[PDB]
């Protein structure tokens, strides 16, 4: 077989995204017969050059995950991606650390397959247009550019939160993500700062193509706004060399392969 076309012919464009009707993962599996154990899918039709590991930071968000899988599996297949879904579940009940879990996902996904692209996605964000491709570009990609909670517009030009995608090389280039941001906020700005220091710019689809919905939700206990975030973001240039992939330590407590995803439960320690 030959290479998949540059743009998939299966795309439908805008989609109605709602979280009213209950989701039954059993149904989801049925509706997605081509997805293999561990939430892996490869085009049988053509050869995709996009080997994508989709990494979701996670803790106590199963209901959101259901909706995420219900909507994304069909979308990702239509995008003709060779992908795998990884939910990185933080064990314990100490402060949440989104970015550290994403680093864990990078390392763990690499043990399964020769991935060349990593999509990092909050568990509650669903794209509204399938032309917003969940893959890597020549520069780091910010995907969730127009969220409904922000009135469908980028909150600030340096915003890199929500859903982003870095090639294996781009991620390695910045020594991955910081492991030192505990609690909510700032870690995405630190990451933006790292990409900028390595001379990269942020690639983004336009606001129409990038429309995204976030399942409405209250704030999680143990992920309160981080008081040190603004001070940390100011020092990214110096700390990125010592805090990242090269300094990541964690313990794997469980690896679960379900038909729709791989869920890795890990102990990533506590604020130090």
């Amino acid at each position: 077989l030959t290479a998949c076309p540059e743009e998939s012919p299966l795309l439908v464009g805008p989609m109605l995204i709602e979280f009213n009707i209950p989701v039954d993962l059993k149904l989801v599996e049925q509706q997605n017969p081509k997805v293999k154990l561990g939430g892996r899918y490869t085009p049988m039709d053509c050869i995709s050059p996009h080997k994508v590991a989709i990494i979701i930071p996670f803790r106590n968000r199963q209901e959101h995950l259901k909706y995420w899988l219900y909507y994304l599996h069909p979308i990702l297949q239509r995008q003709q991606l060779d992908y795998g879904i990884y939910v990185i579940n933080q064990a314990g009940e100490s402060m949440f650390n989104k970015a550290k879990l994403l680093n864990v996902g990078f390392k763990e996904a690499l043990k399964d397959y020769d991935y060349n692209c990593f999509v990092f996605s909050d568990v509650d964000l669903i794209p509204m247009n399938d032309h917003n491709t969940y893959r890597c570009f020549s520069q780091p990609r910010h995907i969730s550019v127009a969220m409904d909670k922000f009135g469908f517009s980028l909150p600030y030009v340096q915003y890199f939160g929500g859903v982003s995608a870095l090639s294996k090389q781009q991620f390695l280039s910045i020594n991955g993500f910081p492991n030192n941001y505990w609690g909510w906020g700032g870690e995405d700005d630190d990451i933006y700062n790292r990409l900028a220091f390595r001379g990269m710019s942020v690639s983004r689809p336009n606001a129409v193509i990038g429309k995204t919905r976030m399942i409405r939700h209250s704030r999680d206990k143990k992920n309160e706004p981080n008081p040190q975030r603004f001070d940390r973001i100011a020092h990214t240039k110096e700390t990125m060399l010592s805090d990242g992939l090269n300094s990541l330590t964690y313990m794997v407590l469980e690896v679960q392969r379900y038909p729709l995803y791989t869920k890795i439960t890990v102990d990533i320690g506590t604020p130090s």
Binding site: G151, Y156, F230, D231, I233, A234
Partner: protein, 123 residues
Amino acid sequence: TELTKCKVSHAIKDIDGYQGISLLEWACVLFHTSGYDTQAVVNDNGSTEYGLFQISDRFWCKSSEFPESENICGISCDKLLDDELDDDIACAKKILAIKGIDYWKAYKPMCSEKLEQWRCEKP
């Protein structure tokens, strides 16, 4: 209530240029500080910060948790959780005059460049 950049900019027009901080800089600072949420309430190591400006009960407003606060602004912190910004602004100006812009930690890292995106063109 989560306000818009322009709703905020118009409400705080008064503050423009005060102590040398422009409206463009304030629009940026307030977005990162409270997400323009007039009801924002956040803890910061033993104290609590309120509203659009995240004014703290440590020295600036009086909360029930810390009645003995210096309460420099001379106001109940609950007055900082509504949609009437005149008192919030008056308090912020006292912080700016006394402590200065450094009070707002987001200013330096997030609002030192690319200030043009923060402009409100609504007449």
